[PDB]
Paper text:
Rab7 functions as a key regulator in maturation of endosomes and autophagosomes, directing the trafficking of cargos along microtubules, and in the fusion step with lysosomes, through different protein-protein interaction cascades.
The bound GTP and Mg2+ ion in Rab7 were clearly visible in the 2.1 Å electron density maps. The human ORP1 ANK is composed of four helix-turn-helix repeats connected by a long or tight β-hairpin loop. ORP1 ANK binds to Rab7 using the concave surface composed of the inner helices of ANK repeats and the first β-hairpin loop. The switch I and switch II regions which undergo conformational changes upon GTP or GDP binding are away from the interface, indicating the independence of ORP1–Rab7 interaction from the nucleotide binding. The bulky hydrophobic residues including Trp49, Phe50, Tyr57, and Phe58 from ORP1 make hydrophobic interaction with the residues on the helix α3 and the α3-β5 loop of Rab7. In the crystal of human ORP1-Rab7, the truncated switch II region with (Δ73) composes the tight crystal lattice interaction, indicating that the surface entropy reduction by L73Δ was critical for crystallization.
Author numbering:
A (entry chain B): 4 to 138
B (entry chain A): 7 to 72, 74 to 178
Amino acid sequence: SAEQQLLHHARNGNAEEVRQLLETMARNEVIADINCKGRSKSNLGWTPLHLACYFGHRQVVQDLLKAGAEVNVLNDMGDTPLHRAAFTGRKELVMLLLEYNADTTIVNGSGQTAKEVTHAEEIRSMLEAVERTQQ
Amino acid sequence: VLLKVIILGDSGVGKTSLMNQYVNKKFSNQYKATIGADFLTKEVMVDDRLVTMQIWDTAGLERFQSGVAFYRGADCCVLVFDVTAPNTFKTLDSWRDEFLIQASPRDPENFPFVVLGNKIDLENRQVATKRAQAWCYSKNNIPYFETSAKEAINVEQAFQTIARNALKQET
Ligand SMILES: Nc1nc2c(ncn2[C@@H]2O[C@H](COP(=O)(O)OP(=O)(O)OP(=O)(O)O)[C@@H](O)[C@H]2O)c(=O)[nH]1
Ligand SMILES: [Mg+2]
């Protein structure tokens, strides 16, 4: 299935197979939702963007965003991809998500914003400035 | 110092037997399936520090599996398969993946896994040592142990690395 393929390759950071999958979806050769959520125990409720942000696959995140992946999708915990990238201290992915106008004020199911879940000071301070402005 | 260790794997691979061999030096040929998830606690020596391991034993049968909320806080995840049942090795990727997204460690690439290939005392082995080692090494060098819960082979050695890596992770 094209969506199961998308979730598999995004989680594992196989950038070329992701790119091939998206350029093929762009031409309607396959039925595939770029914002699909997983149904396996291995990805339940997660988008390909979620998976690639949590596991730190920068190139997959770029290709997904450039191809129009919704930046503000939520998983069953109420986390956005920004939350996942902030949580794991991925500065360069946090920047890339801000470049695509990620909402920094979204509060997850446990009452925390992306700024509030990071341990990287450079990420916390940077999300403080944007959230100051966005709010 | 409380260390939280989760034991995952398909039904019948020997999770409960490895835990009972380690904790009570006992083994039973009779099979009694685990329901849900529960733990015991065991004092263990890591180098020269005495620590407490909270060891969670889990249901391999889907009908007895409950939620995975208890994954949170784990300091180490043990993946068990049966070397005579090759599909129990094939499920290891999804066991590990579900642990990572549900437990959500901050550093998923370095979170400590340990893989036990159990039942090396049986005839009709199907999973090659080299195959299991190559998969473990490809996941950022997961330590791999071959064990027999029945004959008590490498059980103590495995849980010594489990405790050492959980202690490092907890600290
Ligand atoms: N020969 C041999 N038998 C084993 C070994 N380990 C477990 N067994 C047997 O395999 C069967 C399953 O062992 P269990 O420990 O109950 O397996 P489990 O992973 O806890 O199974 P579930 O609770 O259903 O998830 C039992 O009959 C055990 O006696 C082993 O190392 N060698
Ligand atoms: Mg059991």
